[PDB]
Amino acid sequence: MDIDPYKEFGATVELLSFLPSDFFPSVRDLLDTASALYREALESPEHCSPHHTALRQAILCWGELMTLATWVGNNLEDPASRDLVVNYVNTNMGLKIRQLLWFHISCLTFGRETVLEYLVSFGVWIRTPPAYRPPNAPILSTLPET
Amino acid sequence: MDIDPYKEFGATVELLSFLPSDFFPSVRDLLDTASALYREALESPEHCSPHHTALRQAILCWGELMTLATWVGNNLEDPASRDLVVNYVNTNMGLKIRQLLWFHISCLTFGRETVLEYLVSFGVWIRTPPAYRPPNAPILSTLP
Amino acid sequence: MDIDPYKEFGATVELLSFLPSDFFPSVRDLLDTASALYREALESPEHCSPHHTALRQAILCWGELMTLATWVGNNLEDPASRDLVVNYVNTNMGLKIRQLLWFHISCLTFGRETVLEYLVSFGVWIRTPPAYRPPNAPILSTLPET
Amino acid sequence: MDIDPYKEFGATVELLSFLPSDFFPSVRDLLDTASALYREALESPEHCSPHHTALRQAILCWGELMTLATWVGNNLEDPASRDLVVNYVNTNMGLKIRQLLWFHISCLTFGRETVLEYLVSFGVWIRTPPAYRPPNAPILSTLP
Amino acid sequence: MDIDPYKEFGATVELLSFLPSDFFPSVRDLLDTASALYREALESPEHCSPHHTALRQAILCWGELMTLATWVGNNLEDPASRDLVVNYVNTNMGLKIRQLLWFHISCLTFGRETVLEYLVSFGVWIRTPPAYRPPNAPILSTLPET
Amino acid sequence: MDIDPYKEFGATVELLSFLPSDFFPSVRDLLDTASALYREALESPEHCSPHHTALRQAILCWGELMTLATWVGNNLEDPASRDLVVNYVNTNMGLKIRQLLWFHISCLTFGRETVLEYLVSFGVWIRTPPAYRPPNAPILSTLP
């Protein structure tokens, strides 16, 4: 139509595409982070922030894709096709699900503004020549003192 | 963690299960009604309501599954497997997307309280044995 | 002794008997309606209304009868007797459990008065000759407007 | 859904399990004590207390199981199966009815707080190894 | 170092040792008492009293020892050693875990002072010659009236 | 009942799982740091904080498991079984004791909020793919 999923958050899929693809943690790890942090936050009968709302749907999405991987693994004779599809679920669609979970999860943990600033800083920092950039890549601030 | 998608909206998947699987319109239809009613509402830089937000992730999801179907059509050569899998995307996984789309779309066109009393009243209309069922089922409408 | 279960609710077993037996939904369906509507309502450490209180006990009753169906199915050699009893659990005792769940469940969903009025209206409507009754049978009102 | 029957009354089935199975009086006895103490209270057109309400469903239930036993006696011809099943109604399913009846009947004769401190104090009396157990167990009474 | 577990509660391991070892209920029974009484009390994201705090850790301790009994039962060929260790877990370490659960559980149910007074009274009562002590041993008071 | 040990402290075992198993110092080290910092705090007739209380049960526990290891060394004669079991006490069961000790010890040296933002920030440092990870990991310190 189309509808950019981050547009309501002051971001774009092109803004998330600014970071290298070889950046977002595998979806099992993000899910692990969510369950560790916001399980009771999500399983509650109320939207807290739009970020939660987006996040639940994202997780249900990966849950449906996981169900798909199970059915495809269980119900196909050809191994070349079954392997190509089960691998496609995580390699291609998994990049989008990865950035999707990662964006809201970071947005809850730090803030929308902090993540936006981060996408910018890392997007620039990776693009700069090694000689003229700060020695270590930017990370997400939490408790930096004494 | 389980997290019921409707739980934030005062519902449960058990509440949606009251409706028969042969009830929700094909996803293409919900999408068309969505674009017809709430398109500018969705393509907005500001998030309007929680329903819009849930809805957008729903739509983007279905778009991703459609991309999966196109990719399955272009990549796989054998027709038995590609036909079994392209069908599993539409018939099986499509139900979950259908229920969500219908739930928010209807919540938007009428309201949450209307949709909920509706799920209950429809629950009564469906639970009734056929011999004693009213000639017409309840529907949502603004007149009525 | 005896104690009519609905008497505290301003009703009678004879009042529920006014409706045809071929009316109440099978118990799995009622349970489905309960779990869909009042799971969190029932699993809470407090009686909300007497209707809840009656309802929990009713459900525990059907749970005991279901346990009975399992033991009878698992622990008998004769198939004629095992089938006759397992069928008797739902056919005969199941009518009473059906009306029992249905009455409180409707009483919560609409109101005691609304259900009483309904038992009356349907009890009359089924008894009237087809020519002189409204074309469609009464149903339980919820949201009838525009 | 699981819903513990005593949960609304500030108890759990785990709390009742503190009492041994060889503790609750046969259901006929509870019924007799019930009719002796609270019969007019039960046959009342007005619901008195939540305990009465839970109690009535309990009694009506046991009456239904008794009807089941009579029907099993009249319908089945073979004695091995009818004797195994008529016994399963009294010995096995009867325990759950026994605990409920005893719990409310006792809650009525004394009170909830008395019944609860009782379940605890009895829990202590039973948990104790026999060598160190008091000559007499705790009981409920109004004097004492 | 050492740290007496009851010292913060106004007690000592020597104070618990005052009672005969053949007194504390087997750990499955104590756990049963805990789950019956304080399941919702313990599974809550807050320390209520230090007694709860001690108690959770005690239960996790017995849970680890139970896990140990499972691994030792499952992963050893020699039966004399496997039986000697699996029996040692409950016989020796189980006395300490028993008194540990029992002390806090009683401390919650009655009070710290009531349990201290009880350890004293029973410790004396068992030590007195039969002729000159009260006929029945002391028990933990709860609701003694009419 | 499950009861997560950290749940009372605003954490979960899932929150501690963010740290790799090859992260927590051997239990002897935590104990030594404990005696070095909070020994008089622990040997006190008054309970100071919930962390101290949880900590003492943790320490007494590990002491009991160490007694178990000594007893296994003195009782068992066969070396295959005694070596397999004495090792299972240190490597396997030791992890759970390690996490608890480290969690409270660190909560004491710095504070709960510091430890929690730490578990999160470390979660970010670890979740990152190696190619893009910062040259140094976050640590707790009072300067910094």
Numbering used by the authors:
A (entry chain C), C (entry chain C), E (entry chain C): 1 to 146
B (entry chain D), D (entry chain D), F (entry chain D): 1 to 144
Sentences from the paper on this structure:
The virus consists of a host-derived lipid envelope containing surface proteins known as HBV surface antigen (HBs), a nucleocapsid containing a core protein known as HBV core antigen (HBc) and a partially double-stranded DNA genome. HBc consists of two distinct domains: an N-terminal assembly domain (residues 1-149) and a basic, C-terminal ARD (residues 150-183 or 150-185, depending on the strain). While the assembly domain forms the icosahedral shell, the ARD is involved in packaging viral pregenomic RNA (pgRNA). A dimer of HBc molecules is formed through a four-helix bundle which contains two long helices from each monomer. This HBc dimer acts as the building block for core assembly.
Here, by using single particle cryoEM, we determined the three-dimensional (3D) structure of HBV cores assembled from full-length HBc (i.e., full-length core) to 3.5Å resolution and built an ab initio atomic model, revealing differences from the crystal structure of the truncated core. Due to the T=4 icosahedral symmetry of HBV core, each asymmetric unit of the full-length core contains four structurally unique, non-symmetrically related HBc molecules, denoted as A, B, C, and D. The atomic model of the asymmetric unit contains residues 1-143 of molecule A, residues 1-146 of molecules B and C, and residues 1-144 of molecule D. Unlike the single-shelled structural organization of truncated HBV core, which were determined previously by cryoEM and X-ray crystallography, our cryoEM reconstruction of full-length HBV core revealed a ~360Å icosahedral capsid with a double-layer structure. Overall, the atomic models of the four HBc molecules derived from our cryoEM reconstruction are similar to their corresponding models determined by X-ray crystallography, with rmsd values of 0.737Å, 0.726Å, 0.667Å, and 0.677Å for the Cα atoms of molecules A, B, C, and D, respectively. Second, among the four conformers of the asymmetric unit, molecules B and C both have their C-terminal segments oriented differently in the cryoEM structures of the full-length core as compared to those solved by X-ray crystallography of the truncated core. However, our cryoEM structure shows no density that can be attributed to disulfide bond formation between the two interacting monomers in this region of these dimers, even if the cryoEM density map was displayed in a relatively low threshold, suggesting that Cys61 does not form intermolecular disulfide bonds in our freshly prepared sample used for cryoEM. The outer and inner layers are connected by densities around the 2-fold axes. These connecting densities are superimposable with, or in close proximity to, the newly resolved C-terminal residues of the assembly domain of molecules B, C and D in the cryoEM structure, indicating that the connecting densities are the linker region (residues 140-149) of the core assembly domain.
